[PDB]
Structure formats: C-alpha cells, structure tokens
Amino acid sequence: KLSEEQQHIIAILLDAHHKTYDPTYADFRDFRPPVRPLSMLPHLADLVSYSIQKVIGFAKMIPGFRDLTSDDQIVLLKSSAIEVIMLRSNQSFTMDDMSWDCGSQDYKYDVTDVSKAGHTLELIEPLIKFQVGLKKLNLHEEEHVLLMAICIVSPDRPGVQDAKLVEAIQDRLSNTLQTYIRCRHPPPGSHQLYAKMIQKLADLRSLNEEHSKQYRSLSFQPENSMKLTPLVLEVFGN
Amino acid sequence: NHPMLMNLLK
Numbered sequence: 001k002l003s004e005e006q007q008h009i010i011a012i013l014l015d016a017h018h019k020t021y022d023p024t025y026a027d028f029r030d031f032r033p034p035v036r037p038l039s040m041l042p043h044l045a046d047l048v049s050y051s052i053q054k055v056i057g058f059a060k061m062i063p064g065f066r067d068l069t070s071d072d073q074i075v076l077l078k079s080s081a082i083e084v085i086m087l088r089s090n091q092s093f094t095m096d097d098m099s100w101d102c103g104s105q106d107y108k109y110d111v112t113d114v115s116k117a118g119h120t121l122e123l124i125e126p127l128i129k130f131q132v133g134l135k136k137l138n139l140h141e142e143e144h145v146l147l148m149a150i151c152i153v154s155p156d157r158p159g160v161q162d163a164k165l166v167e168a169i170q171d172r173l174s175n176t177l178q179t180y181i182r183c184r185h186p187p188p189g190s191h192q193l194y195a196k197m198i199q200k201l202a203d204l205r206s207l208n209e210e211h212s213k214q215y216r217s218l219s220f221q222p223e224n225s226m227k228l229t230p231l232v233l234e235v236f237g238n
Numbered sequence: 239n240h241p242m243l244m245n246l247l248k
C-alpha cells in the first residue's frame with residue numbers, strides 16, 4: 001500500500017534529517033560555555049539558535065514546502081520552531097536520568113539547567129512528560145522525521161495565508177505516515193500509533209503556548225534579551 | 239521584517 005511516491009517522501013525526509021542533525025554535537029563547542037541568576041541562558045540560547053538553523057535546513061527539504069510563498073514559509077517556521085526543537089531533542093533525551101545528553105557531561109542538560117535559563121516548572125514538567133511519552137512510543141526514524149514535517153506544515157498556524165495549500169502538503173505527509181504505520185510498524189507497537197502521534201502534536205501546541213509566555217516574560221527584561229541571539233529574537237520576538 | 243529567516247530560507 002506504501003506507494004512509490006510515499007517511499008520517496010520518506011527517503012527525502014530521512015536524508016533531510018541526517019543532513020541537519022549532528023549526533024556528535026561537535027558544534028556545541030562554539031556556543032557560549034554552560035555555567036552551573038540565569039547562568040545557563042547564554043549557552044542554551046546559543047543551542048536554540050543553532051537548532052533553529054537546523055530546523056530551517058530540514059524544513060527546506062520537506063516535499064512541497066518550497067512551493068509556499070516566502071511569507072507562509074516564514075510563519076510556519078516561526079510558529080513551529082520551538083516545537084520541532086523539542087521534538088528533535090528527543091533524540092538526545094534519555095530516560096536513564098531524564099536529561100538531554102548531547103555527548104558529554106558539559107552538554108548534558110537536566111531540569112535544573114532548563115530552570116537556570118529562566119524557565120519554570122509550568123513548562124518543564126509537561127516538557128519532561130512529553131519527552132517520556134514520545135520516547136515510550138519508540139518511533140521508527142521514519143515516523144520521527146514524518147512527525148517533524150507534519151508539525152511544521154500545519155494549516156492552523158497563526159498568520160498562514162494559503163491554508164489550503166499548507167493543508168494539501170500536510171495531507172500528503174499524513175497519508176504517508178498513516179500508510180507507513182499500517183504497512184511497516186508491527187503490532188502491538190502500531191496500536192493507535194497515528195492517533196498517539198497526533199496527540200503529541202497537540203501536546204507540542206500547549207508547550208509552544210507556555211514557552212511563548214515564559215519567553216515573553218523573560219525577553220521583556222533587557223538584561224535577559226541582551227543574552228539572547230539575533231536569530232532567536234527575530235524568530236521568537238523582541 | 240525577517241532578514242535572517244529569509245536568508246536562511248534562500
């Protein structure tokens with residue numbers, strides 16, 4: 001049932017993810033150093049800024065994404081950026097000790113590190129629960145990259161002009177995901193997997209909303225906004 | 239409005 005077109009889509013997204021996710025985390029050496037006051041804000045702001053660039057690189061390779069206007073590409077990335085970053089971070093998350101392990105002790109981030117960047121349990125608690133629930137899905141990488149692509153091209157994002165085209169692109173990805181699970185994910189792990197994955201997209205919307213609140217509060221203070229990056233300020237707001 | 243986003247999208 002998985003058409004030739006649908007395997008091609010999966011192959012592109014798998015390649016797009018491999019070209020934009022460095023599992024060695026080598027570039028983390030270029031960030032401002034972590035310090036363990038919002039002592040982790042400079043380092044984690046650099047990390048998020050680095051992640052935005054990777055998310056843009058991935059989005060540019062989603063089939064159909066380039067057929068959107070520049071305005072629609074921008075609003076989709078602006079709205080989805082923090083969700084895809086949280087999604088992508090699941091690859092580094094470990095349930096061994098509920099942390100994001102990016103290759104070394106310096107680049108291992110726990111709830112204390114996120115709190116030392118300015119965020120509170122109102123975000124961090126549902127964030128950890130999201131990372132655990134996503135991990136418990138044990139997605140195929142095929143499912144992981146499809147979920148990221150579907151996240152980005154959502155027609156209900158604020159500011160979308162051409163919602164009909166956005167929905168068309170997303171529908172092709174969703175049908176690809178549904179068919180992949182049916183034909184390639186064996187039971188019992190396949191049980192209601194598509195519904196559970198869409199529920200995770202709903203979770204990300206709520207995490208996005210709470211991150212926006214805390215970011216607005218954080219960035220409202222110039223002492224904090226000084227520690228952000230230009231790209232982060234452009235994407236998330238001033 | 240979004241020059242850095244635009245340039246990365248190029």
Ligand SMILES: [O]C(=O)[C][C]OC1=[C][C]=C(C2345B678B9%10%11B6%12%13B96%14B%109%15B%1172B932B437B%1285B%1363C%14%1527C2=[C][C]=C(C([O])(C(F)(F)F)C(F)(F)F)[C]=[C]2)[C]=[C]1
Nearest residue numbers: 021022044045048051054085086089092100114117118215
């Ligand atoms: O190669 C790759 O791409 C893989 C890149 O690995 C990654 C990327 C991202 C993360 C993370 B994970 B969830 B925890 B939160 B969220 B993800 B992102 B960091 B760590 B912290 C994160 C985070 C930090 C800073 C803010 C800010 O709100 C703050 F800095 F606090 F102001 C910001 F403004 F958004 F930056 C918001 C969210 C871990 C590993």
